[PDB]
Design a protein around this ligand. Structure first.
Ligand SMILES: *[C@@H]1O[C@H](CO[C@H]2O[C@@H](C)[C@@H](O)[C@@H](O)[C@@H]2O)[C@@H](O)[C@H](O)[C@H]1NC(C)=O
Ligand SMILES: *[C@@H]1O[C@H](CO)[C@@H](O)[C@H](O)[C@H]1NC(C)=O
Ligand SMILES: *[C@@H]1O[C@H](CO)[C@@H](O)[C@H](O)[C@H]1NC(C)=O
Ligand SMILES: *[C@@H]1O[C@H](CO)[C@@H](O)[C@H](O)[C@H]1NC(C)=O
Ligand SMILES: *[C@@H]1O[C@H](CO)[C@@H](O)[C@H](O)[C@H]1NC(C)=O
Ligand SMILES: *[C@@H]1O[C@H](CO)[C@@H](O)[C@H](O)[C@H]1NC(C)=O
Ligand SMILES: *[C@@H]1O[C@H](CO)[C@@H](O)[C@H](O)[C@H]1NC(C)=O
Ligand SMILES: *[C@@H]1O[C@H](CO)[C@@H](O)[C@H](O)[C@H]1NC(C)=O
Ligand SMILES: *[C@@H]1O[C@H](CO)[C@@H](O)[C@H](O)[C@H]1NC(C)=O
Lengths: 445, 444, 445
């Protein structure tokens, strides 16, 4: 039992017309959701008849469903190139030709390159002429290049943002006979029950904080968070500098894909050539932000079977529920009971978005809520208690490798100490760029 | 009538100072705003005298006003260039000079060019020498270039961010005599009425979510949202890579404008030259985010009365109102009545920021609030009901082209099925970069 | 006294264990925090005995503690380069060698330079040959370049984001015996007192708005806000395009530092060479966002003891408090008293992130809350009133240089006019890039 009640009243509702007005006297209880696992135990008494009725209302979960917005596919790409050098006055290497080369025109040096539907480009670099470089003509020679992209892996990744976060509070309700039911509530919503009604009257749940983020789906392999804003168009140095509208087009490096300017770099070396890319590896990004991840005590994880991502509040929930009881009002509420907590472990890293996981062993005799805090109240642990002994865990963020933090916890208001002690690893500054490519295939030596 | 009351009590208020303490007995009611169009119907009874009065409070709107922060003007620019190639040892084409050319040095080749206050730069590219390139000297020739920018349109765009979102809750109150009045409430605000007072005692409204955004003003042509962080300094590939401190500076491409480094590309071709830019077209950006736009159930629109932008809550409203009645208390509240709802149409795109529009026909016999949800509650619809038949719409976000979703709706709690069905279009990945410029005009 | 009460009730609470029940009758009040400085004055009456008790609850502060995530060090860097031009067939200037030069290979031209652990790179640029350029050989000459980075100042900056914002609400309570005490509340937290309990039963405080941001620490000289998303990897044109894992690595410009590609530009001039950078100056960014800073009525400032940054609500506080009194209930609450307010000054910028500071002179005869709004309610002022005459200030945001805004204010609901007037300065579009570097030191052949 939890002490969740905020107000208790009697209210008459009148079906105004249909010429014959009907009134219903309802007992009213304004209660707080409190936290996941918190349970209001309400003994009701008949307003009119001498009758009693015991009700239990439990906050089971608080979820925000991500309704997706813009979306694209991407993957790991690598350049492959063909090269050929012609001396001045040989082949296409005349007057303006080399300096005038366009991206979309394939050189005659590569007449075997047929019809392509792959991301590709063509280049011509002026190299040295004269006897010193194997030519009779002393004017600049021409290095012709043809380059296409290819998928390193045969898997792709879909990046998307979230436009809507649709709240759903779920409650478990125990009736007088002990029969259990669940209900779902949206913002400003009401459900009817056997004994009256329950309504989410004030809702303060949402994504709040100071960081923009986005998500990645790996088909059949889960989701990942990206701790950066969703890039709307392809930009060099960002996730999605190459992007497509389908998984298959990533794998084939189809030409319908978009890419930011100048992603392919060229190192002319007379008769040798290197074409390289220094692109963001989206799979490295995925492995870091791999779900579940917790940010501002929202835990983002894969939905039941749904797919798509939800944000779970596994601790405190900020919502007011209005309870109306047909012809019954509050007689008394059930008092909270004390719990015993022991420290189990602290695992993870410091100065990182993923944070650290602290685990507790919590022993009690009734359902309720453990609340804990450090001295200055910068850390806050909120975990469920039950009849028996269960292990509960939540994410915390620290900025120090050697953690030794004293907390004060209780389920019933009498605080006792508890020392959280652990060793966290550092995560050194990283780069997601990966070099790809190398020597070209020389066509005519 | 909407069912909004959460508590009812009597409270006494006493003055603590003065020649004498005065006491006031007041009935007190705590209600939820519920949603736009929701109306609380309260019948009051006298606490000491035997009297009744009927009172009605309606939530008319919930607005967040944008108070702007940093701002800048931008637009569409194209490059114009002059070119002149000199053989080595001719003109300025001496020793180090070509490879040492500064952006702010104008070549003697272009003396005919007047005094400028336009964004401009100067380049020198080494080119081939010898008889093959029209020169006796075999050393590199010098291609001298003078480039300036010009506005492509004679209009500009103003980009800004929002630092403050200030809440204004608007209520319609009907007194006992049927007299209607309007009040506006901000955070922790109270306003006195004929019959007591009403105060916004708890406010949970605000901009939330996982996206940062900014806005654009097109002078005389409304507003647009940008689904991206406001960039505070000029950056290539971003809105505002060229920016100014005024509209007139954009139109004249004034030299006071800032631009990110290396925005003009050069393709030297001996005696031909191309100077191009690949700039973000801000007008393409404006059109895609043109207001009104909905994000996380906030509808962004131009404020009423000329300018600034606003965020409207057109469905759910999360706010608590404390009502105080002088010498009166709650007798009873009005019950909600049922809605009939029919699905009209569903129009728009999927997997897009703008979303899709569901339209419904709602028939009722009193003012209230339609509430609808799909099977797993990932979709939620809140629209106002009235006496009679009205069309109500709201934005939803889907991720599939063929939508067929069953909803359960009600105004009074008696839920009935409603099937939303339709076809949404795809929005293929886009790029706002547009190529501009071309060949130089050749001087000799 | 402030009028903060929202509801009042009686509840009976029963303990279920022991295996006989004890029941306690309690009076209940639901009040709003209202604002910093708001004070609820309750006189209580006995539920069973006839007795009176006096109680005072005051909102002292509402804080959001930043728990940090990813962090990195950065600073100001400048390049220094050595150059030496060799004619073709002299030194290493053979065949392919110049066009094939790798970044981490040091030329023989600079053997006199010892080995460094500094960020550095090496280049080779082809230049003109023949008699025109000081060579007998007509083939291209080689300009060899060795560049290294160095810190411009002997100080560094630490950039970080905030993953968690942990709420602490602070109340000052005067109990039945006149004893004054302070208590702290987290989300969904409860505290037992001499007279019952107070719980933070609904919390709507948190960071909201349409902007992402991050923070910088200047060691021993405070903090600054950055009005932009935290960049998770080094990127050109962004804060942190060069970044390190320690302060000492910034000062020594250590090679362990990461940098975005292509940060050093090269201008080869046959026997002259310039190496430059166009880097974001982080100290200019720091100065612009130096704390305290206010965004969406949250004031960001350094914590006391200077451990982290904090977000203060200095005006409105959106929170509901459930008060429970053992064997007592609400008799009456103290009425609000009136304010007189005079406009002092208006100082700051328009169309700026920092905004402008409005200062007011407020006179009252009791603690309370001044509330003000302009004609259309787009501007909102909430300041604390006290016994006597005090200066109160807060940040507003305007978009015009000549401000003249008409407000209506009150503490007790009786609105009176107040004219806010002043001149604000413009902050013209800026660029934080600063050019650094210059000519190389030329080695004698
Ligand atoms: C309010 O303060 C009263 C004394 O404060 C005096 O301070 C002077 C600086 C000047 O402002 C005088 O006008 C003030 O009277 C004190 O007598 C009252 O008891 C105080 N009231 C409360 C409710 O604490
Ligand atoms: C290639 O590019 C040029 C200009 O860049 C364009 O005019 C032409 O239509 C393009 N297509 C082909 C097939 O050359
Ligand atoms: C931490 O404790 C939990 C709870 O017993 C356990 O499941 C987990 O394996 C522990 N982790 C480590 C690293 O010991
Ligand atoms: C609580 O758990 C204990 C197990 O030791 C059991 O004996 C008791 O009956 C349980 N009580 C309830 C109410 O389930
Ligand atoms: C060119 O720019 C430099 C600074 O980059 C400046 O010192 C110099 O005066 C400029 N040249 C002219 C001719 O103004
Ligand atoms: C959809 O219905 C709305 C409301 O009835 C109407 O305004 C609109 O024209 C309709 N649109 C389509 C595409 O049918
Ligand atoms: C509904 O509107 C009709 C007019 O169309 C009116 O006659 C009737 O009184 C209204 N009913 C209610 C309950 O307001
Ligand atoms: C340059 O880097 C390569 C690895 O790519 C390494 O093998 C080589 O030894 C490095 N050169 C020097 C001089 O250390
Ligand atoms: C404005 O008034 C405040 C309050 O007294 C004062 O601290 C500040 O110095 C004043 N500023 C100016 C610019 O006059």
């Amino acid at each position: 039992c939890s002490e969740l009640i905020q107000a208790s009243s009697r209210i008459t509702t009148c079906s105004t017309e249909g010429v014959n007005t009907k009134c219903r006297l309802s007992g009213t209880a304004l209660i707080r959701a409190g936290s996941v696992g918190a349970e209001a135990c309400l003994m009701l008494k008949g307003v009119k008849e001498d009758q009693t009725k015991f009700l239990k209302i439990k906050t089971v979960s608080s979820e925000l469903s991500c309704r997706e917005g813009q979306s694209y596919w991407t993957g790991s790409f690598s350049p492959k190139c063909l090269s050929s050098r012609r001396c001045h006055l040989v082949g296409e290497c005349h007057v303006n030709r080399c300096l005038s080369w366009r991206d979309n025109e394939t050189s005659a040096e590569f007449s075997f390159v047929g019809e392509s539907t792959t991301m590709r480009e063509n280049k011509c670099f002026e190299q040295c002429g004269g006897h010193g470089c194997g030519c009779f003509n002393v004017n600049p020679s021409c290095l012709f290049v043809h380059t296409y992209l290819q998928s390193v892996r045969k898997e792709a990744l879909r990046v998307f943002n979230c436009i809507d976060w649709v709240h759903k509070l779920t409650l478990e309700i125990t009736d007088f006979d002990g029969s259990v039911s669940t209900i779902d509530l949206g913002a400003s919503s009401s459900r009817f029950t056997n004994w009256g009604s329950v309504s989410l009257s004030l809702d303060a749940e949402g994504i709040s904080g100071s960081n923009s983020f986005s998500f990645i789906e790996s088909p059949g392999k889960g989701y990942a968070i990206v701790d950066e804003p969703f890039s709307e168009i392809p930009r060099q140095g960002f996730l999605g500098e190459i992007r497509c509208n389908s998984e298959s087009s990533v794998l084939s490096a189809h030409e319908s894909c978009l890419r930011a300017p100048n992603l392919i770099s060229y190192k002319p070396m007379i008769d040798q050539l290197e074409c390289t890319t220094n692109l963001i590896d989206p799979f490295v990004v995925f492995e870091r932000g791999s779900l579940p991840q917790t940010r501002n005590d929202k835990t983002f994880a894969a939905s039941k079977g749904n797919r798509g991502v939800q944000a779970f509040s596994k601790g405190s929930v900020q919502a007011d529920l209005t309870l109306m009881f047909d012809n019954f009002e509050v007689d008394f509420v059930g008092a909270a009971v004390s719990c015993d907590a022991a420290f189990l472990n602290l695992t993870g890293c410091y100065s990182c978005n993923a944070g650290a996981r602290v685990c507790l062993s919590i022993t009690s005799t009734g359902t309720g809520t453990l609340s804990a805090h450090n001295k200055d109240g910068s850390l806050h642990i909120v975990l469920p208690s039950e009849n028996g002994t269960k292990d509960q865990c939540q994410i915390l963020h620290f900025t120090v490798p050697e953690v030794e933090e004293e907390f004060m916890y209780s389920c019933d208001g009498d605080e006792r100490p508890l020392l959280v002690k652990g060793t966290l690893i550092a995560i050194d500054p990283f780069d997601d760029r990966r070099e790809a490519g190398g020597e070209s295939t020389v066509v005519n030596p």
